[PDB]
């Protein structure tokens, strides 16, 4: 059966990805929390 | 269809009283003196 997450590099990097989070202030937030947390993969 | 209770060590060891391997049907080989299975060809020599 068709399950979820039919992977796609382009959409993955479009809906997510550094420049997309840097396009909205709320996007800028999640990077802020992820650095405060010391995350290694930020977007 | 599930065990209503534990099988104690006593019951366990009791059930497996008859669960054992038998010593092989081995006889001495007439050409080499090493043991072989009866009615089989000796694997050390290769006789009868």
């Amino acid at each position: 059966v068709k399950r979820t997450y039919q992977p796609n590099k382009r959409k993955h990097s479009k809906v997510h990805g550094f420049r997309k989070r840097m396009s909205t202030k709320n996007g800028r937030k999640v990077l802020a929390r992820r650095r405060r947390k010391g995350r290694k993969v930020l977007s | 269809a599930v065990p209503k209770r534990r099988t104690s060590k006593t019951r366990k060891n009791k059930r497996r009283t008859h669960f054992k391997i038998s010593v092989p049907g081995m006889t001495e080989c007439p050409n080499c003196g090493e043991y072989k299975l009866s009615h089989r060809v000796c694997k050390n020599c290769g006789s009868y």
């Binding site: - | 054992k20 391997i21 010593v23 092989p24 043991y35």
Partner: protein, 112 residues
């Protein structure tokens, strides 16, 4: 007097190794070897080798010649188990315990 030989972390579940050792307990060395080499089980090759080592140990370390040796006592006890899983149905996973065995054999001359 007594020669020792041990095999550790053998990859056979101890319930299965003990079935073969329940035959060579207290028999002579030659008869014991003939049993192992002819019993058609999985553990048998690995035990025939622990016995072999004991007997070699006896000759090379005590001058205990192999014609008079008897497996004084031979046993097997649990070892460091390896834990694995099997993907079963409806997303559930069941466990599989790959067990091991610490095989011991001591052969004696019956003497002091």
């Amino acid at each position: 007097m007594e020669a020792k030989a041990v095999a550790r972390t053998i990859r056979i579940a101890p319930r299965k190794v003990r079935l073969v050792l329940d035959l060579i307990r207290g028999k002579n060395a030659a008869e014991a070897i003939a049993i192992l080499k002819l019993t058609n089980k999985a553990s048998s090759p690995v035990i025939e080798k622990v016995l072999m080592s004991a007997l070699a140990n006896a000759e090379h370390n005590y001058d205990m010649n192999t014609d008079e040796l008897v497996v004084k006592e031979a046993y097997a006890n649990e070892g460091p188990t390896l834990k694995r899983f099997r993907p079963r149905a409806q997303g559930r996973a069941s466990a599989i315990n790959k067990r091991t065995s610490h095989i011991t054999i001591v052969v004696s001359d019956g003497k002091e």
